[PDB]
Amino acid sequence: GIVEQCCTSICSLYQLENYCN
Amino acid sequence: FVNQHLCXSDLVEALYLVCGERGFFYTKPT
Numbered sequence: 001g002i003v004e005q006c007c008t009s010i011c012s013l014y015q016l017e018n019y020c021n
Numbered sequence: 022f023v024n025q026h027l028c029x030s031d032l033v034e035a036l037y038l039v040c041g042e043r044g045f046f047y048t049k050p051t
Contacts (some may be wrong), residue, residue: 001048002045015034016027020040020046 002019005011027035036045 001050003027003032003047006032007029007047009025009026011027011032012024013022013039016032016035016039019036020043020045 001007006015026032032047036047
């Protein structure tokens with residue numbers, strides 16, 4: 001999945017932007 | 022700005038204010 005470290009553990013904001021489209 | 026868990030309305034919160042009001046899509050692979 002895309003929302004890996006995010007929805008599971010720690011993450012990065014710039015990573016959230018990637019999901020956008 | 023937090024470096025914490027990013028899930029649901031949290032990871033969503035960002036995604037919404039991060040994406041840019043242009044809709045998005047997390048995992049849910051088909």
